[PDB]
Design an enzyme around this catalytic site. Structure first.
Site, PDB file in Angstrom:
ATOM      1  CE  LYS A  29       7.572  11.649  14.358  1.00  0.00           C
ATOM      2  NZ  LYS A  29       6.319  11.742  15.168  1.00  0.00           N
ATOM      3  CG  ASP A  67      -3.122   6.034  -4.535  1.00  0.00           C
ATOM      4  OD1 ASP A  67      -3.337   7.070  -3.856  1.00  0.00           O
ATOM      5  OD2 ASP A  67      -3.707   4.975  -4.298  1.00  0.00           O
ATOM      6  CB  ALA A  68       0.124  10.522  -3.661  1.00  0.00           C
ATOM      7  CG  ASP A 113      -0.764   6.288   2.912  1.00  0.00           C
ATOM      8  OD1 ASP A 113      -0.264   7.327   2.399  1.00  0.00           O
ATOM      9  OD2 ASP A 113      -1.998   6.107   3.011  1.00  0.00           O
ATOM     10  CE  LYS A 114       1.132   0.992   7.814  1.00  0.00           C
ATOM     11  NZ  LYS A 114       2.419   1.502   8.443  1.00  0.00           N
ATOM     12  CG  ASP A 167       5.356  12.138  18.727  1.00  0.00           C
ATOM     13  OD1 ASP A 167       4.804  12.550  19.756  1.00  0.00           O
ATOM     14  OD2 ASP A 167       5.353  12.773  17.649  1.00  0.00           O
ATOM     15  CD  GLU A 186      17.504  18.987   8.378  1.00  0.00           C
ATOM     16  OE1 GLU A 186      18.679  18.781   8.753  1.00  0.00           O
ATOM     17  OE2 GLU A 186      17.226  19.752   7.433  1.00  0.00           O
ATOM     18  CE  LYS A 198      -8.235   0.098   1.171  1.00  0.00           C
ATOM     19  NZ  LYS A 198      -7.968   1.521   1.581  1.00  0.00           N
ATOM     20  NE  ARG A 214      -2.577  11.219   5.235  1.00  0.00           N
ATOM     21  CZ  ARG A 214      -2.946  11.921   4.170  1.00  0.00           C
ATOM     22  NH1 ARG A 214      -2.144  12.870   3.696  1.00  0.00           N
ATOM     23  NH2 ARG A 214      -4.130  11.708   3.596  1.00  0.00           N
ATOM     24  CE  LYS A 215      -3.576   3.445   4.936  1.00  0.00           C
ATOM     25  NZ  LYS A 215      -4.038   4.843   4.678  1.00  0.00           N
ATOM     26  CG  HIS A 275      -1.883   1.133   1.277  1.00  0.00           C
ATOM     27  ND1 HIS A 275      -1.528   2.423   1.620  1.00  0.00           N
ATOM     28  CD2 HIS A 275      -3.212   1.172   0.997  1.00  0.00           C
ATOM     29  CE1 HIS A 275      -2.589   3.212   1.512  1.00  0.00           C
ATOM     30  NE2 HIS A 275      -3.627   2.470   1.161  1.00  0.00           N
ATOM     31  CG  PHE A 292      -6.247  -4.142  -6.805  1.00  0.00           C
ATOM     32  CD1 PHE A 292      -5.273  -3.226  -7.212  1.00  0.00           C
ATOM     33  CD2 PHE A 292      -6.486  -4.288  -5.433  1.00  0.00           C
ATOM     34  CE1 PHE A 292      -4.553  -2.454  -6.259  1.00  0.00           C
ATOM     35  CE2 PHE A 292      -5.773  -3.530  -4.470  1.00  0.00           C
ATOM     36  CZ  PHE A 292      -4.811  -2.617  -4.884  1.00  0.00           C
ATOM     37  CD  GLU A 345       8.385  13.052   8.195  1.00  0.00           C
ATOM     38  OE1 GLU A 345       7.805  11.958   8.095  1.00  0.00           O
ATOM     39  OE2 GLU A 345       8.408  13.691   9.255  1.00  0.00           O
ATOM     40  CE  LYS A 362      13.343  13.014  16.161  1.00  0.00           C
ATOM     41  NZ  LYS A 362      14.820  13.164  16.385  1.00  0.00           N
TER      42      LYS A 362
END
Ligand code: CA
Ligand code: CA
Ligand code: CA
Lengths: 373, 373
Positions: A256, A229-230, A15-16, A262, A54, A151, A235-236, A13, A221, A41, A260
Site C-alpha cells: 500500500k 505451503d502457501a 507470507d513474508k 492504514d 491495482e 521462525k 497475513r503477518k 517465510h 527442515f 497483493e 492508505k
C-alpha cells in the site's frame, strides 16, 4: 507471574516473501513516480507467484519491469534452487494488476514501552532481533549451510511487570540436508544467533541462564518457502507490529502506498507513542487517534498509560495535540513517506528496528513534548 | 470522553469472498472426511478466483468438486452478472492445491463484555448487526436493488465506560446503476437497516437521537467485489474477532481445519470469556492462555478484568482451570469442531453472532463456573 510469547519469521517465510514482493513493487513505482497509488497483493504457493491488484502511476517502465522485480526479490531472499524448495530465476510468475495513468471513520493505535532500548515490548523485540540475526549469519557466510525460511518464538516470564526470566526460545531454520541437527545446528544457532543477540541487548533484569532452547524441534527442515505451503501479503500483521502485546485496528501495511491511512497513520501512531515514552512522560503508553469522515484533523486523541504515567494522562493528550499534526498530508510530509523506503520494512517488523533507520522511529519530538507538557 | 470506532463488511466484500470460499472448501472436505487436514487460501481480483494451499483427505469426490463449490458460493453471495462486477457462473477459477491421502509456544486471547446481549463490545456488535441486516434486506427482497459488496462503520461515544451516544454510522452499499442516492438509497437504508437494528438491540443507555448518518458518502457504488480490486483469505482478522477492542495473537481463521490451534484455541478462549461474564464474575474480561511445546494442557492461564470484577481475579483464574479442559483434543471434542459448520462464520464475525448458533457462544459453563468460584 505471567508468561508472554511473541513470534517473528525470516524474510524467507512464505507470507513474508509476499509482503516483500508487494513492497518491492511499491518501491519501484514510488522511485519513478512518488505520487503513485498502489494496492498490490502477492500470493505464493509451490513454484509460483501471483501478483494482483491495482496501480495508478506514470512509472510505466517500472510497471513493465514488475516481473523482473519479483524474480530479483526472491533471489535476494536466497531462493535460487529447487533443492531449496524454490528458485526465483525459474518459478512461475503471473501478474494480474490493473493499471491506469492519473475518507473513513477511524480509530488507530500506537504503542511504546521502556522494556528495551528500542522501546518495544520485550517478547516481540527479542523475536525480531533473533529472526534478523538468523538471516544475518546465513548471508554473511558465518553459517553458510542455512537456507532462507525460519521462525523464532520467545516466551518471557514476568513478575509484577518486570521481565525476570527468558523462559523459552524456539528457533526453526531451513538448512542443507547433510547438516547434523545435534552436533552442528543446535550449538551453532545457540552460539551465533541466541548468544550474540542476548549480548547485544544486554538486558538489566532478564535472566536467560535457565532458558529452554529448542532448535528445529520438529527435526530436518530442508525444503521451505512456498514449497508445499502457501503465503499471502498481509497475513503477518501482528508480527509486523507489536507481537500481540498491543491492540490492532486490522489493516495490513505491505503493498500500500502512504495515502492508505492504514499504513501512514499506524506509522505516525508509533512515532507519537515512542516519543511520549522516550520523553519520560510514561513507562508504557497506548495512543489512540480518532478520525471523522470529511475532516482532515483528528476529532479525538486518547492516551492509555496503564498506571505508568509520570504526569497527568490528560496533559499527555493535550501535549500530543499541540506537538503533532496528524492530518494525513502533514504525516506524509513530516515522515517524508513518498520515497522508496518500504521493502526493508516487509520483514523483521515495521517498528523498533535496530538494523535500519525509519522516520517513525526517530526521537525527534522528545524535546517538543517536554516543552509542551 | 472517549470515542471508539469499529467496522464490519458484508459477505460480498472481496476479502470476505475469500474467507467464505476457503471455509466452503473446508466444510465440503469435513462433511465427507472429518479428519481432513486443510490449509486453503483464496485470492480474488477482477474476473478471477485463485484457490491454493494444501490438503490431506480421503474426501476425493469433494476435492474433485472444488471448482463447483467455488462458483456456487460466489453465486450464493449474489455475484451473478458482469453488471455487478463479478459473476460466479462465468468468472475465472484456478485451483492450485496440493493434495494427498493420510506443538507451539503460544499465547491466545478471548474477550467478553456486558455492553450487548451477545456479550461483545458495542462498536463491533452493532457494526456486524448492521452489515448482516444490510445483506438480509437484499436477499429477502425488501431492497432488491442492492448488490453484495458493503461496509459498515460505527462510532460510539463513552463517558466513564458507559456507552452514552451513537456518534456516527456509516453504511456503504453496492447497488444498481439506476438508483437515486438521495431519493431512494438514503431513506431506504436509514429505515430498513439502521432503524430495525437499533430497535432490535433496544440498548439501555445508547442515545441515538443525534447520530450522524452517512449512507454512501463517496456516492455511486455500482461495481464491487473483486472488480477493480483484490481480496485474500485472512485479511479481516479484526473484523472476524473483536473490532480492535481486544488484543489479537495474529492467526487468521478461514481455510484452516480445527487442528490449527490458531482457530480452535481462539474459539475456546471466547467461550471461556463469554461464560465468565455471563456468570456475572466480571463486567468485562480478557482471558489469556499460554501453551508450551511438548505439553498438551496450558502452562498458564491469566485473567484481566480491568477493575470490573465481582470477585478476586485470582478466584476467576482458579475456576477456569477447574471447569475448562483446554487441551486441543478436549476443545475439539467439547465444541464438536469436526463438522461442516465453518462457512457461516466467514462473514459477520466469528464471535457474538445473533443469527447463528455457534458452539463457542453457548452459555453452557455458567453453572459450572458458579459452582467452582
Ligand atoms: Ca512450510
Ligand atoms: Ca524537535
Ligand atoms: Ca472495491
Amino acid at each position: 507471574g505471567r508468561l508472554f510469547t511473541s513470534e517473528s519469521v525470516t524474510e524467507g517465510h512464505p507470507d513474508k516473501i509476499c509482503d516483500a514482493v508487494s513492497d518491492s513493487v511499491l518501491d519501484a513505482l514510488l522511485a519513478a513516480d512518488p505520487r503513485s497509488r498502489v494496492a498490490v497483493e502477492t500470493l505464493v504457493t509451490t513454484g509460483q507467484v501471483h501478483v494482483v491488484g491495482e496501480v495508478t502511476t506514470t512509472a510505466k517502465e517500472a510497471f513493465a519491469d514488475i516481473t523482473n522485480i519479483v524474480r530479483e526479490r526472491i533471489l535476494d531472499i536466497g531462493y535460487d534452487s529447487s533443492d531449496k524448495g524454490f528458485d526465483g530465476a525459474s518459478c512461475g510468475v503471473n501478474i494480474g494488476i490493473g493499471a491506469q495513468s492519473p475518507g473513513d471513520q477511524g480509530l488507530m493505535f500506537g504503542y511504546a514501552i521502556n522494556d528495551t532500548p528500542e522501546l518495544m515490548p520485550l517478547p516481540i523485540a527479542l523475536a525480531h532481533r533473533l529472526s534478523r540475526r538468523l538471516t544475518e549469519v546465513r548471508k554473511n557466510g558465518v553459517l553458510p549451510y542455512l537456507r532462507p525460511d525460519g521462525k523464532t518464538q520467545v516466551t518471557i516470564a514476568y513478575e509484577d511487570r518486570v521481565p525476570v526470566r527468558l523462559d523459552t526460545v524456539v528457533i526453526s531454520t531451513q538448512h542443507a540436508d547433510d547438516i547434523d541437527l545435534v552436533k552442528t545446528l543446535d550449538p551453532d544457532i545457540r552460539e551465533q544467533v541466541l548468544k550474540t543477540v542476548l549480548d547485544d541487548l544486554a538486558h538489566d533484569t532478564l535472566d536467560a541462564s535457565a532458558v529452554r532452547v529448542l532448535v528445529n524441534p520438529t527435526g530436518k527442515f530442508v525444503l521451505g518457502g512456498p514449497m508445499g505451503d502457501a503465503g499471502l501479503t498481509g497475513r503477518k500483521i501482528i508480527v509486523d507490529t507489536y507481537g500481540g502485546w498491543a491492540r490492532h485496528g486490522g489493516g495490513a501495511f505491505s503493498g500500500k502506498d502512504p495515502s492508505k491511512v492504514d499504513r501512514s497513520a499506524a506509522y505516525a501512531m508509533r512515532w507519537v507513542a515512542k516519543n511520549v515514552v522516550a520523553a519520560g512522560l510514561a513507562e508504557r503508553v497506548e495512543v489512540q487517534v480518532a478520525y471523522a469522515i470529511g475532516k482532515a484533523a483528528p476529532v479525538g486523541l486518547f492516551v492509555e498509560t496503564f498506571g505508568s504515567e509520570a504526569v497527568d494522562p490528560v496533559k499527555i493528550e493535550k501535549a500530543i495535540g499541540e506537538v503533532f499534526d496528524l492530518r494525513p498530508g502533514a504525516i506524509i510530509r513530516d515522515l517524508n513517506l513518498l520515497r522508496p523506503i518500504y521493502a526493508p520494512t516487509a520483514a523483521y517488523g515495521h517498528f523498533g528496528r535496530t538494523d535500519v533507520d525509519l522516520p517513525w522511529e526517530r526521537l525527534d519530538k522528545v524535546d517538543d513534548l517536554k516543552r509542551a507538557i
